[PDB]
């Protein structure tokens, strides 16, 4: 027996999804979340800090009264499905694909938005949304790898934001935590939604 | 700022960065304010109960905002029994 | 009439936000001049400071456009600057007025010595820089007046400062840079951390969070 | 070469405070530096500072509150009488409501207001606000 | 050259979007449909739009065409993509982790996690 705790099962799933595999380079501001460098050169991320940051991000998200004020977007193809499902289940908005410049600053644009919070899969590929949000007092949550830039990143979750499995697992995990904190679903590691729904598929 | 009598004289009291203590000006559009909700014994968010943090454009552009907020949240959670 | 396109404009039109200090506290951008007109419009006065022609060389001659500088102020701690270039002087002036209204800022006024009555001068020594022009503002005793050139004097009068000493260096004949440096110096008034601000900040709900339900529609 | 250890210490603290660091290192240590730090701490512009012994000049680690706008040394140490304090304050301090000028007098190292209170002159060491 | 202008392209795209149900792959039938469901000042413009619409329909028959949003295509894509496999593609029974990951888990205290094995 010896049923695992929520954190134990969650970290097991992260290991299965390879969330702890970083790149060969580490940012000086992301070093605090890295455990150690392996002989090959790939930095190993600390899944405990990753889980704690996921908890913190879920705590921040749940405090938003209107979920429609939260915008989550992914520039890369792999995370598009993950962000779409996250928005669908958490009740927020999703922007999949290229981000239109001026969306947060051009008040006369048809796509003009004033989000209370921004969620990003990778700062490097979502630099333009982050730069625009820097001009509108918009807090930022970003899934940051070892080499991701931390500029204008309010809450950086240390995780592998390049693998489809890792991105899907991370977004599924965040959605489950937000729903559990809201109280619409049962507590624990288990959630009725299939994890593979967040995975990129040919 | 107050008068000799004791009346408030300033137009308003600007906020201060939770990490650097710098005054946040009216046109510092890079500054942000975040609310971290509190959880009960059952891991359920309690409406209206959160810790508020303010970050200035200077630190957010410097990129130390993430670590500063992490440290501040850790200390505040330890103080407030949020575990 | 007016159809707000921003949450801040919607709140201002619905009367949820009644003072400019509420916006200044959270540093929310102001993108509609109707907000300023509704909030502090009645007490605002505008003044055209300079009409500057500029020319772009073209294959078939020089294309001339006019630059309008406008200063708006309430004389009670609110001042704004606007610059607009346009083919027509009237259009340039209108755009400059709109931009100055949008760029209105709060100005902190303090005391030179004894703190009796309303503030009369800048709380502390401040300096603004635009291009090569540097403008330094120093507190002055009551009755000293505004010791400054015409342009900074007009800006200070619109800001509502009673007495101050000023010094200038650089190409002050560049009126745009002179007025911009004065505006920067005035803006820097509220950025200086003084002992009276050492008290820990007690945060309050931002307007977008306080009236989120109203803005949800 | 090293000419003013007080200048080096004050510049280090000023740069660290601008950068937003919570702690700053001062090397080498000196009793003049310690007196200056005590003067600042009395008015609350710095936190605790700890002296580290190394069988040499020593070191200091100072915690920074975030309230220090600027601290600097005045060189050369001009003679300041009790009547020149007003002029020096007008020259150096942003305002008459706050800010301190540190002087070394025969009664010890102290701020300009305490020097005025005791009617003692001396030599200007630096300033902070 | 023969390059369709923005007017022709936009008209064809909008017509296909709004009346995909009745569209055919025959130019004459498409032009009759256009005459029925649209007002085109010029017969030459009508023929050009009909031809471009026929070409766009031929491409759509192959597959998705950027700039054209079809309700049936989008709904079919959503229905297909919303499916899930019988078994989830995340094997927690066996997890091969390097010695560095073993040390990470030991530091975390999770040195007993089932299924975790060194290479
Ligand atoms: Mg000596």
PDB file of C-alpha atoms in Angstrom, chain B residues 2-77:
ATOM      1  CA  UNK B   2       1.563  66.955   7.424  1.00  0.00           C
ATOM      2  CA  UNK B   3       0.926  70.557   8.415  1.00  0.00           C
ATOM      3  CA  UNK B   4       1.896  72.021  11.779  1.00  0.00           C
ATOM      4  CA  UNK B   5      -1.695  71.526  12.940  1.00  0.00           C
ATOM      5  CA  UNK B   6      -1.569  67.899  11.791  1.00  0.00           C
ATOM      6  CA  UNK B   7      -3.606  67.879   8.586  1.00  0.00           C
ATOM      7  CA  UNK B   8      -2.656  65.635   5.689  1.00  0.00           C
ATOM      8  CA  UNK B   9      -1.275  67.828   2.914  1.00  0.00           C
ATOM      9  CA  UNK B  10      -0.041  65.402   0.264  1.00  0.00           C
ATOM     10  CA  UNK B  11      -2.259  64.712  -2.736  1.00  0.00           C
ATOM     11  CA  UNK B  12      -1.791  60.961  -2.245  1.00  0.00           C
ATOM     12  CA  UNK B  13       0.591  58.416  -0.729  1.00  0.00           C
ATOM     13  CA  UNK B  14       2.356  56.483  -3.527  1.00  0.00           C
ATOM     14  CA  UNK B  15       3.012  52.786  -3.096  1.00  0.00           C
ATOM     15  CA  UNK B  16       6.476  51.338  -2.508  1.00  0.00           C
ATOM     16  CA  UNK B  17       8.151  48.315  -4.050  1.00  0.00           C
ATOM     17  CA  UNK B  18       7.878  45.316  -1.741  1.00  0.00           C
ATOM     18  CA  UNK B  19      11.515  44.429  -2.544  1.00  0.00           C
ATOM     19  CA  UNK B  20      13.476  47.631  -3.247  1.00  0.00           C
ATOM     20  CA  UNK B  21      11.344  50.108  -1.230  1.00  0.00           C
ATOM     21  CA  UNK B  22      11.456  52.487  -4.209  1.00  0.00           C
ATOM     22  CA  UNK B  23       8.511  54.839  -4.632  1.00  0.00           C
ATOM     23  CA  UNK B  24       6.230  53.720  -7.469  1.00  0.00           C
ATOM     24  CA  UNK B  25       5.372  56.747  -9.598  1.00  0.00           C
ATOM     25  CA  UNK B  26       2.154  57.425 -11.492  1.00  0.00           C
ATOM     26  CA  UNK B  27       3.736  56.752 -14.907  1.00  0.00           C
ATOM     27  CA  UNK B  28       5.674  53.624 -13.867  1.00  0.00           C
ATOM     28  CA  UNK B  29       3.574  51.391 -16.114  1.00  0.00           C
ATOM     29  CA  UNK B  30       6.025  48.497 -15.695  1.00  0.00           C
ATOM     30  CA  UNK B  31       5.120  48.183 -12.001  1.00  0.00           C
ATOM     31  CA  UNK B  32       2.691  45.439 -10.988  1.00  0.00           C
ATOM     32  CA  UNK B  33       0.564  44.424  -8.010  1.00  0.00           C
ATOM     33  CA  UNK B  34      -0.091  40.763  -7.192  1.00  0.00           C
ATOM     34  CA  UNK B  35      -2.446  39.051  -4.750  1.00  0.00           C
ATOM     35  CA  UNK B  36      -1.591  35.585  -3.414  1.00  0.00           C
ATOM     36  CA  UNK B  37      -4.703  33.935  -2.027  1.00  0.00           C
ATOM     37  CA  UNK B  38      -4.784  32.096   1.284  1.00  0.00           C
ATOM     38  CA  UNK B  39      -5.833  28.466   1.717  1.00  0.00           C
ATOM     39  CA  UNK B  40      -7.740  26.855   4.582  1.00  0.00           C
ATOM     40  CA  UNK B  41      -6.965  23.518   6.244  1.00  0.00           C
ATOM     41  CA  UNK B  42      -8.626  21.711   3.307  1.00  0.00           C
ATOM     42  CA  UNK B  43      -6.631  23.504   0.603  1.00  0.00           C
ATOM     43  CA  UNK B  44      -9.555  25.734  -0.399  1.00  0.00           C
ATOM     44  CA  UNK B  45      -9.124  29.383  -1.344  1.00  0.00           C
ATOM     45  CA  UNK B  46     -10.753  31.757   1.154  1.00  0.00           C
ATOM     46  CA  UNK B  47     -12.386  34.637  -0.779  1.00  0.00           C
ATOM     47  CA  UNK B  48     -11.119  38.096   0.099  1.00  0.00           C
ATOM     48  CA  UNK B  49      -8.027  36.819   1.950  1.00  0.00           C
ATOM     49  CA  UNK B  50      -4.702  37.318   0.181  1.00  0.00           C
ATOM     50  CA  UNK B  51      -1.235  38.807   0.594  1.00  0.00           C
ATOM     51  CA  UNK B  52      -0.499  41.833  -1.597  1.00  0.00           C
ATOM     52  CA  UNK B  53       2.904  42.492  -3.176  1.00  0.00           C
ATOM     53  CA  UNK B  54       3.970  45.448  -5.320  1.00  0.00           C
ATOM     54  CA  UNK B  55       6.922  45.313  -7.718  1.00  0.00           C
ATOM     55  CA  UNK B  56       8.475  48.320  -9.425  1.00  0.00           C
ATOM     56  CA  UNK B  57       9.465  48.648 -13.056  1.00  0.00           C
ATOM     57  CA  UNK B  58      13.130  48.947 -12.100  1.00  0.00           C
ATOM     58  CA  UNK B  59      13.305  45.515 -10.458  1.00  0.00           C
ATOM     59  CA  UNK B  60      10.967  43.902 -12.988  1.00  0.00           C
ATOM     60  CA  UNK B  61      13.202  45.082 -15.840  1.00  0.00           C
ATOM     61  CA  UNK B  62      16.294  43.980 -13.902  1.00  0.00           C
ATOM     62  CA  UNK B  63      14.748  40.499 -13.720  1.00  0.00           C
ATOM     63  CA  UNK B  64      15.177  40.040  -9.956  1.00  0.00           C
ATOM     64  CA  UNK B  65      11.413  40.361  -9.445  1.00  0.00           C
ATOM     65  CA  UNK B  66      10.900  36.588  -9.566  1.00  0.00           C
ATOM     66  CA  UNK B  67      13.427  35.806  -6.825  1.00  0.00           C
ATOM     67  CA  UNK B  68      12.378  38.801  -4.722  1.00  0.00           C
ATOM     68  CA  UNK B  69       8.711  37.784  -4.879  1.00  0.00           C
ATOM     69  CA  UNK B  70       9.601  34.170  -4.086  1.00  0.00           C
ATOM     70  CA  UNK B  71      11.517  35.218  -0.966  1.00  0.00           C
ATOM     71  CA  UNK B  72       8.816  37.662   0.141  1.00  0.00           C
ATOM     72  CA  UNK B  73       6.072  35.072  -0.342  1.00  0.00           C
ATOM     73  CA  UNK B  74       8.049  32.440   1.565  1.00  0.00           C
ATOM     74  CA  UNK B  75       8.528  34.796   4.512  1.00  0.00           C
ATOM     75  CA  UNK B  76       4.907  35.975   4.484  1.00  0.00           C
ATOM     76  CA  UNK B  77       3.548  32.422   4.257  1.00  0.00           C
TER      77      UNK B  77
END
